[PDB]
Amino acid sequence: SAEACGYSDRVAQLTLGNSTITTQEAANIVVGYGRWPTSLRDTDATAVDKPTQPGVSAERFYTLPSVQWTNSFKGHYWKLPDALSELGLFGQNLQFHYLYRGGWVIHVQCNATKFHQGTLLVVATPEHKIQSAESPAFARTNPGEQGAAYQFPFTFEDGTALGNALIYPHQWVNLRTNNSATLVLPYVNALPMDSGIRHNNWTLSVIPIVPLEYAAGATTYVPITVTIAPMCTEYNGLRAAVTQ
Amino acid sequence: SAEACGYSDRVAQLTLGNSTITTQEAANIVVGYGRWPTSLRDTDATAVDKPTQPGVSAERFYTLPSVQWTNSFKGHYWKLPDALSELGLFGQNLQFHYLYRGGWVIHVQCNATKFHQGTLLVVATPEHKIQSAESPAFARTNPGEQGAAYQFPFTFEDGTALGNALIYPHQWVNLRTNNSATLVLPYVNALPMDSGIRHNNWTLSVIPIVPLEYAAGATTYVPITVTIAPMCTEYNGLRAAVTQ
Amino acid sequence: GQVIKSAVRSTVENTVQSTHSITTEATPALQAAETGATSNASDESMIETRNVVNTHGVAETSLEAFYGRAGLVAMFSTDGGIYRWYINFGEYVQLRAKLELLTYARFDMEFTIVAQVVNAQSKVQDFNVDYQVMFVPPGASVPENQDSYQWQSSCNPSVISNTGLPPARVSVPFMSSANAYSFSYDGYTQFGDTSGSSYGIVPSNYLGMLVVRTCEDLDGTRLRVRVYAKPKHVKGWIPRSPRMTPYKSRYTGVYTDTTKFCANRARITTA
Amino acid sequence: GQVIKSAVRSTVENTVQSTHSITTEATPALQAAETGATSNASDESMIETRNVVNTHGVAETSLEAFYGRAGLVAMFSTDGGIYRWYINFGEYVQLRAKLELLTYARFDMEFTIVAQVVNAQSKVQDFNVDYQVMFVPPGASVPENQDSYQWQSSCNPSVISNTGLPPARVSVPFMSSANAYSFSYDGYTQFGDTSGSSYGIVPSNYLGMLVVRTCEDLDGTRLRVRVYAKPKHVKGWIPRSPRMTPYKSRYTGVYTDTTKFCANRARITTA
Amino acid sequence: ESLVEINNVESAEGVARYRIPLNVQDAMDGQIMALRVDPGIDGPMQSTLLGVFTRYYAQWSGSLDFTFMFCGTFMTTGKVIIAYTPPGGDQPTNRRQAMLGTHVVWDFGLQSSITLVVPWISSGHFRGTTLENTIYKYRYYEAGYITMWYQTNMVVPPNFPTTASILMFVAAQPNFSLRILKDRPDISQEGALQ
Amino acid sequence: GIPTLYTPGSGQFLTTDDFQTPCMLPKFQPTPVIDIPGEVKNFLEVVQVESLVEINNVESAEGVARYRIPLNVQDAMDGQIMALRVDPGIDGPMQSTLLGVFTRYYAQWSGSLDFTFMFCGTFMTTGKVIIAYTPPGGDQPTNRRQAMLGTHVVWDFGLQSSITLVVPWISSGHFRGTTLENTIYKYRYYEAGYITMWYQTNMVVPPNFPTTASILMFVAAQPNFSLRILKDRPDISQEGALQ
Amino acid sequence: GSNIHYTNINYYENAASNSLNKQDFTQDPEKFTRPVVDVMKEAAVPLK
Amino acid sequence: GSNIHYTNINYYENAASNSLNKQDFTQDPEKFTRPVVDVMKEAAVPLK
């Protein structure tokens, strides 16, 4: 037994709504700050209208466009909820409401072969600011479902050390060991709820720290795929649809 | 007391979600076939996926574009759920799911003055076919939120007698008596659930049976307004958005 | 007697979860402002609400919290080493406007005095000098000069301090002959006189004057003084319509007529 | 819910004596950083240890001990006898870098004000003068001159002291409209605007400004002021990656890119 | 409750500024009025009881009560819809858009008034009372808009006034509170008073 | 008036003082404390989290490459791979780590250190390396034989990609200064020793495989670690007011 | 917010010397908001 | 170190006026150091 001998099995299945994700080379599952997503308590709430809780229509896995691990690859990132703001009913509920609150289940995928070597840091950073520029471009602060390429990985795009990003919930995809990373993230903010079109609570980054190399002649085209599922979500302040 | 003396008070308030409708000249409230909307029973259900129940985000009042009671007015009708297929989150949930089930609360409004006379039949007809033409036009079978004008009121657009439409849930807006009609409708179909983009379970008709007349010089511009709220709704078979 | 109770709360009202309502009975939204009563429709009756245990307090809007802080009431410079200030709060508008939010009020007060020496060009000097502030109740003789006998102050209360020490400060009780100070008086100051100059002022609000001097003569310089007052232990009655026009006079509420309070906008349909 | 407990300790962990181990079962040294978990190998498992009753405390690294001391947040000189300082801690890097070690934090603050008089050549003067520091919340009118009416301060809190007295000092509670101050905000200040200038700043962190003046006019000299702030009763959440590049702007975290943090050495094999 | 100086336009002077103009329409779904709901900002609300006290503080919280009283003749009828649009975008452009938010449909009748409760819907427990942007970027706190539209039409008998008025009242609900006292920006002076 | 005698210190402003003082807003009532994940009560919770060491700090390495320890197929035996002073607060590879930053906010430290290494070559790439900790007294070991006489671990590359070498707290005193600044304070007195890595066997690969690979190095404080005497972090500075 | 361990001891003879009151409650506003003789329930119509 | 005979009496109304907190403990760092779903014992291999 996995829990008997005290280790973590390398296989995993994530089922939410009408979607199921499997992996046979995982490295346990991270639960950000040891906290699973939770509903807003009556003693923490402030907005008085009865919230909307879409359930399975929004709490399911959404797969975003894949990214290629090129030779010059510096890394890629996605803002949440920005990246899903226009996908399925999660996106619709986000657009039609002023307030949103929710957690996430993130699954990053990248397989190669036992003839390849490389290492990706997969980190979920709370309040990750893209401030390498005097006046940040909207295209980079809110890249949408396509995400944006890193330009300053060493400084984590915010003036801190890449090596210290480990203080945030993370895992690594070390090709010789695993081909996927899974992170469960609770809602984090200084408020009980917030606007999903003006503020991104988390930023998912996939950064190559050890370049992709391989036996001469092996497959050179190696994609990285991100699948994300909103979890335990609720919305308040219904009105017409509004996007940023 | 209204319930003590055995009569119906002329005032009413309908509150659903973030919407409230009031009237001071109502004529009781009709509950179609004496049945309030209800959820699908486990013994009646067939689709196995856990349903989506949007709650307040979709179960609220939506007001459609008003219609003018012109001199040549023959009547107007709206198909349900067709009329709301593109309004708010009800519309979004309808588009993103193969299956839909739900009830309705309909409120028809038309005020004039004690110097006007006229009578509108407000009827909700199950499976109301627009079959006056050899090959019915889509624009008339599914008129959308704008609804469609009646062309054959006497034959109820289906080859039956207008006068017998009273066999269906209905009320009248008789200007000397009331300025609004309210109907609560349960889901009706030969199936537990159905497609909201291929089948319209109910048709709301507002037909003038006694022409609008008034003291010379009075306001001649008299609109008719329809406000409808989905009630006790659920959806199954999630996928990308699809409209008819 | 009192037909409407006044139960006390220490937090605002909670929100209780509510559901839909389709009826001809209850109609919370329908109102009638003609009655003179403010609407009684609650959030829970107008929309579907959730449970909210609201612990927000109400302390900062209590009379004590609103009035319980110092505000400037007097500011002047001596002339010939002396200055006579008639006690009244109409000179400086901020505190004045606050008090006029109530019709009647009882309260004690904390007066704080800040004084400095300034020269003829009104430039502040680093010069420590002893000064005396004497409270002269109505009817007592007011000193004419910096060295008059009244400064002996054997009965009148006086406070002697120095510009080199911290600001002087003393508390005064609720001193009116009335049972509350009045911040609005629709009457005259005396019988047999109906001249406008004696209208709208209740004499019992005037408790006297503060006369100030430097104990000894300054050479070419003057004493600059600021007096601050802070209401304490406030009890108030009958809220009033707030001042909505600039003040023009120290003793009357006279004002300049206006055709609008807020600025105009292009059209009523564009927020 | 929370699946990982957080038991409290008042001292670091003791060391327990251990012996040799020759087995195929227990392998403490083998790890897998890919999981995202920090190694769990203990000293006792890697080498043979002795008993050590370690009484070393952990107090000096608590949030209260780390943040609980004053740091400079403002420094300026009056101009025309007045100065307007918008309250924010981005001007002086030391305290700024400390706060950015946390994502969210609640705390009260103790502000200490040290003021002196300096001349045109910026030489300090032995001159005692009264000064006033007024807190103007957003929305309140900010005084234009040294003698404007707003200085009456009947509602705005003000503190009046003298350069001859000890530094002025007052405490302020946790004032944000939010449930915690935020030291990192990945969002915009308003809807309908996506310009870079309005990115990365949470408005609720700005509680207003401090406006300072000398109560009376100085002759040819100015008032030099330093404001220190000390967090108290600190509660913090979500530790952040420390600043590793110089600050360039007061309101943004913009920085100059670099290819190294520490200095280079000849070779990786020579320590 | 106190009156909102809602009709603050060039053509309206004094008392006329409290009246919302209503008239017999010849088109449908038209708009009647619009207003930001923020109680402490410059505008129609600043001279109300709620506005004055809100302007004595820096932060507020709570639901608001907006009550409207129809003042046409007994024979004048009509139905209007009043909607509250939570923040995120601009004020609604048409009735269909407005109708998607919190609202009430008002029917003129014996009970002359209706109440639209603008429930407290905010990200934070409090909001700043000013939306001053240039310095503080407080536009961050905008609470949304309240708009009114013809649900049907104002209808009258022969020779009746084809225009009528609606009075607008506003007050704080029982879950309302204020924090951080500050000087009311409206009270000022240029010199000592005599 | 109660007779009192004021003493030296009166009126002084000690930045670390701790007195009660009047509040600007005496009746203010703060927003409620809500449930937010990740509360931290002591920064010792942070230094116990592993972070990357900027170990390959040489001219030829820029940015991200500075975190990689180079490993390659050898043609000689017992060769050295890397070396480093273990002191957490001195200038060098450790200064930009979580442990290093906080250690640099203090003047003294104590406790065992956790150095974890992760191999990042292909699944087919094998090897064994020895990582050793040399307590103070002399210079860093010159060869594997010398290094091997100290505290060490032999690491075998395999399914479990990482290994931990615990640098146990071995010191004369209960604490050590965080700097080794010599010219003024002669703090070289506190040097904690060295950590070195050597090929135990060799890195071996199949035909046509990358003959070079990388090792990532992590460091964190152990549960018996603590810091004393707060001081300003030498890395944070400015030459003028910021605008 | 406010303390539960506050020391209230008066050093002076007259109450006017005392510090500010520490109650700060609010009361039902009915005497101002609904000063009517006949009770008008929220669920019923105001006038009939 | 710290005293066992410290006098803690608050002289002011608002808690913001109080002196610094005197707890200063530390907590298990697991939520940061080992935020994983499956427990991984120190004696066993991490992945299997």
Ligand SMILES: CCCCCCCCCCCCCCCCCC(=O)O
């Ligand atoms: C000896 C120390 C001097 C200190 C000052 C003492 C002043 C005593 C007078 C107090 C009277 C306060 C009455 C306030 C009401 C006035 C209202 C108004 O201006 O209409």
Ligand SMILES: CCCCCCCCCCCCCCCCCC(=O)O
């Ligand atoms: C009247 C006496 C004046 C004393 C000063 C009072 C100052 C009140 C303002 C306190 C607000 C502190 C908020 C700290 C957070 C700011 C963080 C940031 O800069 O981003």
Ligand SMILES: N[C@@H](CCC(=O)N[C@@H](CS)C(=O)NCC(=O)O)C(=O)O
């Ligand atoms: N006017 C006096 C000089 C002033 C004087 O001595 N005044 C006395 C008696 S009239 C006094 O009462 N002084 C009060 C004071 O100055 O404190 C004279 O005759 O020269």
Ligand SMILES: N[C@@H](CCC(=O)N[C@@H](CS)C(=O)NCC(=O)O)C(=O)O
């Ligand atoms: N501007 C005044 C001079 C300044 C003055 O007296 N200001 C008064 C009223 S505007 C004030 O409010 N002062 C506050 C203070 O200085 O404390 C004049 O008319 O000469």
Ligand SMILES: [Cl-]
């Ligand atoms: Cl404004």
Ligand SMILES: [Cl-]
């Ligand atoms: Cl504005």
Ligand SMILES: [Cl-]
């Ligand atoms: Cl050093």
Ligand SMILES: [Cl-]
């Ligand atoms: Cl050194």
Ligand SMILES: [K+]
């Ligand atoms: K549900």
Ligand SMILES: [K+]
């Ligand atoms: K639900």
Ligand SMILES: [K+]
């Ligand atoms: K309560």
Ligand SMILES: [K+]
């Ligand atoms: K009612």
Ligand SMILES: [K+]
């Ligand atoms: K009310």
Ligand SMILES: [K+]
């Ligand atoms: K111990």
Ligand SMILES: [K+]
């Ligand atoms: K292990």
Ligand SMILES: [K+]
């Ligand atoms: K460890």
